[PDB]
Amino acid sequence: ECLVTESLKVKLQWASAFGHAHERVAFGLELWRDIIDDHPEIKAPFSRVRGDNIYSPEFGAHSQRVLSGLDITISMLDTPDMLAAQLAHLKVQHVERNLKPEFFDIFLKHLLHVLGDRLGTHFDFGAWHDCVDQIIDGIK
Amino acid sequence: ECLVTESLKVKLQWASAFGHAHERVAFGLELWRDIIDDHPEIKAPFSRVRGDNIYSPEFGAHSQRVLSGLDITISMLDTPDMLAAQLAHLKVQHVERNLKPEFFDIFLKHLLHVLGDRLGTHFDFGAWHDCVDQIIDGIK
Amino acid sequence: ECLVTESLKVKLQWASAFGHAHERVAFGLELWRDIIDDHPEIKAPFSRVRGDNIYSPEFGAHSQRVLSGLDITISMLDTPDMLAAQLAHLKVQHVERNLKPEFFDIFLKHLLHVLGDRLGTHFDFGAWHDCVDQIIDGIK
Amino acid sequence: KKQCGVLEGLKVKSEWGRAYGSGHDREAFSQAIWRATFAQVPESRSLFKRVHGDDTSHPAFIAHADRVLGGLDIAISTLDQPATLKEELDHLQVQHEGRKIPDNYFDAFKTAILHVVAAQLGRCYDREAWDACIDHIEDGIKGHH
Amino acid sequence: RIRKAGSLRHRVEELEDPSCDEHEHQCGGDDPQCISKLFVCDGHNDCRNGEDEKDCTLPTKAGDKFIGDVCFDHCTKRRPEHMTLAFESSSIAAFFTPIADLHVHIEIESETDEDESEVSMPADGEYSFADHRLTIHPPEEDGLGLVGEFDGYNFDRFVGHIVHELSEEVCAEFIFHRKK
Amino acid sequence: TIRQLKARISNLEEHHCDEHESECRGDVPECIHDLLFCDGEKDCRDGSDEDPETCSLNITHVGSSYTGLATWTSCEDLNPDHAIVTITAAHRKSFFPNRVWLRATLSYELDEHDHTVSTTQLRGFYNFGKRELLLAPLKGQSEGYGVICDFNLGDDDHADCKIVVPSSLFVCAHFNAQRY
Amino acid sequence: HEHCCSEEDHRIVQKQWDILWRDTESSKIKIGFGRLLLTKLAKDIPEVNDLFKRVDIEHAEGPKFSAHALRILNGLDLAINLLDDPPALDAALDHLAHQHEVREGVQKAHFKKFGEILATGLPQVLDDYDALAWKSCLKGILTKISSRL
Amino acid sequence: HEHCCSEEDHRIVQKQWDILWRDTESSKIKIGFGRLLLTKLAKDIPEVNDLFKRVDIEHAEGPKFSAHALRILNGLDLAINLLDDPPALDAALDHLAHQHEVREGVQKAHFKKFGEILATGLPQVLDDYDALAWKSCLKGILTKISSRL
Amino acid sequence: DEAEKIDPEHFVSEIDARVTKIEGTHCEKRTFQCGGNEQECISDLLVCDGHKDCHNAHDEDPDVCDTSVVKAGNVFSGTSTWHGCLAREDHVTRITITASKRRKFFTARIWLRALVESELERHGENVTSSFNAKGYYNFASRRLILLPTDDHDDHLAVVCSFNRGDNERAECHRVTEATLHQCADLFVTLEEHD
Amino acid sequence: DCCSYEDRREIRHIWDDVWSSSFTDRRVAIVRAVFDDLFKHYPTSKALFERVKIDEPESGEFKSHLVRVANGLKLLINLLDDTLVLQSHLGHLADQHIQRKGVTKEYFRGIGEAFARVLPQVLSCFNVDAWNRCFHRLVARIAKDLP
Amino acid sequence: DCCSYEDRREIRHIWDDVWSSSFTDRRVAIVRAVFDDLFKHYPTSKALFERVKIDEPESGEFKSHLVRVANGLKLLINLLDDTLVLQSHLGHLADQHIQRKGVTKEYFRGIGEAFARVLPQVLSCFNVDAWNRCFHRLVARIAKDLP
Amino acid sequence: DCCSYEDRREIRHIWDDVWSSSFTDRRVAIVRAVFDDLFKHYPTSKALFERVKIDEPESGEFKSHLVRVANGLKLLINLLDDTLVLQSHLGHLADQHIQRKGVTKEYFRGIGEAFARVLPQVLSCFNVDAWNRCFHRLVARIAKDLP
């Protein structure tokens, strides 16, 4: 698994990085942009939420909804009973539907890249990789 | 063609983004750098204007001349009679020479990427794509 | 080799860019990150200095040691007797281990990319390319 | 006192860099120095009668002053490397030989320089060092070896 | 002459990054010393100087009426021209100098569109010793409250800011003058 | 003496108003647009206006001269010279609480040596709200030079003048002035 | 007249010329730079080599010349540093005129060339260079120095 | 003076130790952290398990111990928060000495170890840690606490 | 007798200075601002020639040059609040000018020796740490710099500035030479001689 | 009608006091305490959450739920400055409840009352009215399709 | 001659007043009004622009031209702070006119007079001299090449 | 004992006076002057550097060496603010000397004396004690590994 510290570290850093209000939308946007430019194949399933124009409110909304869920998982994360439950809950919202496996491995790649910029050198890559990974697999 | 608002929007945003004096050279530079790193095949035709060293004054000059033309076309757009004419004029300066059509599709990709940074989330991707596109095809 | 001015220019710009104390570690880190993301094949030889986690102190140390040597070479170069010697000294520390020749061509690519950000438009690409190159070949 | 040699040179050469400065600081630095010199030996004003020594603030003299420090610069800046210094000193030696120039004035002019420099550098300034070097430079101009 | 000069002193005390804290009180004077606003007037002496005990007079009397002239009202719908501030009661705890508790009625003569309305909302509040700043806890559920900070004697005239008590957002300024 | 202090001090903090509004003199802060002066009548409720400090003689008074040492960014090769902007005439009528619309002269030494001096005639007004004196060359020179002087120390005497180019209003030189 | 060669103009030149003397090893620079400047002059116009013969220009790295390299380069400094005091600068330059007048062989065309060289060189060591400002000032200087010949 | 624990030194420690109590759930932290700290002690030196027997160390999550975890960890707080008042801190610690003196089984070597552990732990929860400053202060504290034998 | 204690003409002066203190430099540092007439900057050393820097001259006017107020031999006391480079609790410092050379005239610069004491508690009773210092006063700087002599203690150098706006009073700091950091804040006041 | 900007600011703050730390613990107890008030008044709704196991309060399968609800609210509030996006997600939030068979327009008006009774107890300086106003605008649109 | 940095600043501003409208209408009328003055004085030049259809004033094929001229001038002015680049494009601007058979050194000195007569009418506070100075430096280098 | 933060600051400055210029020249002469003092006192050590050709002082093969030593010291000092990294490279610096057969614990204590005698001559305002303190902490960890 993860370590209890390795979590608190992420729970904490997520705070500074993510931020509040607009600061977030900015984060979300910056994230998805980098992702879609790297793998335009994704603009496909995001058809429902105007994935062609990530600056649009339709997508913007989505963007936020996503990050929010990520917030939950991360906030779940430390305390096992909630995480195990939350993760199971996410798995369902996915299994039903097709998604590629590797897409998430991509999402993670960038989420770390971005937090890297936001947090700087303090960014505990180790802790995040070990920790956010666990969140991806479960949903996955 | 484009919508009369969809133009004014670009005409306006171009203003803030492009800027004045040095602020521009900076823009031009940032733009071409990103373009050439993505597709070094371009350093070829830019041989006349020291395309190997984009920081050089020779290229810098070029860089500016380009953006300027882009400025014209854009401020051209708003009134159809002038645009239709200007565009036709640009097509000629290009047809003669041979180019690869995809280069422009690239140029556009970045011009939007850059404006994205400059303008932020307000950036009306839709308007630009629909509008700058119409300027590229004409030249090609 | 270099020119006399083409050196001083680098010797000077290196100063502003590299910096002092922490400002450096930051530089080093930013550099290696960009390098390893582009060519993860490198995480291999850096196994001794925890290359998997570039934020680690183990790697951080390394990072610095590297940049430092680069500092030397750059300082060296103007006075030929010291450079010729220093370069020869570096060649030895490399020849023995097998390495990829192209790795350095990569390192250089980024070192310039980074200095580009740090220095801005003033960055004398020409001077650096002509100059740092000479430092790489000797090593390689 | 301090020995002259390499280091004390590097020190003066560096400190001089800060004290000399440029632009107006310079036009004054020199001004101050000369005022301090003439204040010590008013007798010497007679030598610069050609370049309005009567009015230290007259452009002609301003030029002269700024022109003098100029040489002193070359001296100090070259100074520690022997090859070059040798030359500058020799050059000066000539501009002076033919004349006799009494050691009384040079002394005052040194003092002037020192006091002003000290006033300009605030705290980081080695007296002995400057004294030693300004001396070596002056000797090279009087050429009473 | 004294006050007139002392008054000048004040203007100066206001300039600058302040010796004492916002919270803290600057004793004076020859030798500075910073003590808490809570901290004077313990009854122990903070001050060599003895400030915490020499300032003979409590700014806060009782019975006073103050008329405020509006000059910036985001805050209410009607915006009134004026706003009377009547002080009903005032008592100091026997142990505490520093804070005097007040009971005040905030009177208002508005004209409504339909008719004319008159109001006399009552509210609790305190006056702090050092601050010369009386805080009138909001009459309303709404939590619009008044906060007037004195020059003090001079002048009983005080600028009255209407704020969101929690936020301390200013959204209404009235210049209050003591009615004689 | 005290009076002069309270003055020097008072002339120098912000005022609420965004540009081309000024506050009524009196107790109320309140801000009204610069223009409305005069109705002839009290624009203000307060009638702060009617008070002498506003309708004053001295203030309006013509043939006040301000000088300082002009240091040219632009023109003056030479060593910064004395600048003197002095008022030559300025319209009153009778009532008029307000700001004059006036004529003056800007003179600045060529040299010490030369003992010569440029004297351009100017036209312009004085902005109450702005506290600023704005003069330009009367005409017909086609190159004439103009000058902007800001009051606001709060003092009378003292101003932050800048010799501009009547075109673009671009700062040719700057000189901190006193009266004379 | 005035406008050409302005306060702003030289204020700029002065600022940019200072980017050079940031490090204590001014000598190494001034020399190297001045050395090159004079060399590149003799390159385009050889009748010069004979003028600088007196200072052993034959040995570029020779102290004899290195010293000279300074004197000249350092004179240019003086010129620049007096740009903000016309009367002084004037005098300072006039003096330089006389020091060149009695050196037969030195003709105007030499300075014109040296100017072009100097203008192509500066921008090679200074990242921030304002050709317009410099040319304006360098002209005034070079001219006044050679006017008396 | 110089020897002991500088103003800047502890001013630092204090600032860094505060990064911890930013969120209201200090209890959960102090406990978990103090819990781990003591555990990792009994891990390296078992004769400890018998000392903390009285507080049911056997049940790390057991309230009996969790409470203790606080008391200790909270004592360390007191120590740190009194770093800027030597006489008080002194007294405060001396008192802690006595509370450990009458607890036979507790020997110096224990603290030395706990110190090393604490020094390896802090930097794991605090992103900004100044090893030098901390070691300096923790030493002074741990020593004075075990001083009484 | 009561009247001699409140001089108005004195109080007013306190406010003037008090306010003038509130009313930065236009000029560049270690430059001298001239008087009302023009407005020009002059380099410090040059301006205090001792002879008139300028025409006017600002300096020449008797009010500034006036030796007496400036003159040392004064004792200055006050509380020294530490950042605590020094171990020891807050306390008082007592700077007292021992000697003061110049030329006969000599305005600009005043070289001086002084005695710096503090009253601090060691274990045991009240002690007094005195070290001897040497330094200078810069007329223009409005600065008094006191460095330790050769003492084994070598207790750190004190630095005081004038413009309180009183002459009497000065703002000081204990600092290290090398570091040239500020270790402590010290506001002194001249003690009455009688 | 549309909500006043000041009020939004008021709430954007009031919330920062209940949401509070990044901890689950707190937010949980609050959102729970909110639902307990919804169930004590509209007991019918209780059944709707058997899917998340409400019969096991400390389950975790349920706790996590509570959090999602909390966070979903958080997401709303933290969107009050980006109107256009809020307006969309606000819809999306409706659709997620319309497809949840058994969710009445009433239950919502009910949970609204819930907060208005809970919040004023978990923190002081609660502008019940301001909250109520902007909360209604949010609820209305969430129902809004549904009926 | 040389010009002075202050003057450049003066112009870099004066222009911002004529240019200033965003898009075409304004700049067009001005540049046009400029040429009309060129043709009324050096009628000869008129013929040179048959390629762009000057016989059809409102053509658009011609209007666009006017704009290009305007923008080309704009580009110059907006380069006055980057000397080195200006010096190059200034050359490039010459070559584009040397290959245009029929363009005299005179026609340029003529269009220069044009602006100096037009601009002072389209905006107030026009430093005719400052403009004239820097415009000449620009023209000289453009024209000069051709010979 | 330990190093105070103030002391670190002292050094972080003292160094900026010896290192400063970009040039080898200076740093060389200093580091050399340091070794010359090491050899005049512990002549035995001299032999250890035949690998770099100490018999050829101006060699360059040796000068470069001096620089590496200098820079290695520079790297140390410029790490005093990043403790954890310093603590590691400090070890790595030991290992590079343990594998160098012939390097005693003494020679280090000897080069330490060297600086303490040289530095105070190349720059003024040298806090010999402060230096000494932090230099020892650095040496101790370097040397110790060796025996």
From Swiss-Prot, chain D:
The keyword Lipid metabolism does not apply. CDD domains: Mb-like. It holds the Pfam family Globin. InterPro entries: Erythrocruorin, Globin, Globin-like_sf, Globin/Proto, Haemoglobin_extracell, Mb-like_M. It comes from the Eukaryota. Disulfide bonds join 4-133. PROSITE patterns: GLOBIN. GO terms for cellular component: extracellular region; hemoglobin complex. Keywords: Disulfide bond, Heme, Iron, Metal-binding, Oxygen transport, Transport. The keyword Nucleotide-binding does not apply. Residues 3-145 form the Globin domain. Heme b binds at residue 96. Gene3D superfamilies: Globins. GO terms for molecular function: heme binding; iron ion binding; oxygen binding; oxygen carrier activity. Belongs to the globin family. The extracellular hemoglobin of the earthworm consists of 12 subunits that have a hexagonal bilayer structure with a molecular weight near 3.8 million. Each one-twelfth subunit is composed primarily of disulfide linked trimers (chains A, B, and C) and monomers (chain D). This is Extracellular globin-2. It comes from Lumbricus terrestris.
Curated annotation (Swiss-Prot), chains G, H:
The keyword Disulfide bond applies. Residues 4-149 form the Globin domain. This is Extracellular globin-3. The extracellular hemoglobin of the earthworm consists of 12 subunits that have a hexagonal bilayer structure with a molecular weight near 3.8 million. Each one-twelfth subunit is composed primarily of disulfide linked trimers (chains A, B, and C) and monomers (chain D). Disulfide bonds join 5-137. Keywords: Disulfide bond, Heme, Iron, Metal-binding, Oxygen transport, Secreted, Signal, Transport. It comes from Lumbricus terrestris. It is found in: Secreted. Belongs to the globin family. It holds the Pfam family Globin. The keyword Protein biosynthesis does not apply. Its main location: secreted. InterPro entries: Globin, Globin-like_sf, Globin/Proto, Haemoglobin_extracell, Mb-like_M. PROSITE patterns: GLOBIN (PS01033). Heme b binds at residue 100. One of its GO terms (molecular function) is heme binding. One of its GO terms (cellular component) is hemoglobin complex.
From Swiss-Prot, chains J, K, L:
Residues 2-147 form the Globin domain. Disulfide bonds join 3-134. It comes from the Eukaryota. Its main location: secreted. The keyword Lipid metabolism does not apply. GO terms for cellular component: extracellular region; hemoglobin complex. It is found in: Secreted. One of its GO terms (molecular function) is oxygen binding. Coiled coil: none annotated. The keyword Transferase does not apply. The extracellular hemoglobin of the earthworm consists of 12 subunits that have a hexagonal bilayer structure with a molecular weight near 3.8 million. Each one-twelfth subunit is composed primarily of disulfide linked trimers (chains A, B, and C) and monomers (chain D). Belongs to the globin family. This is Extracellular globin-4.
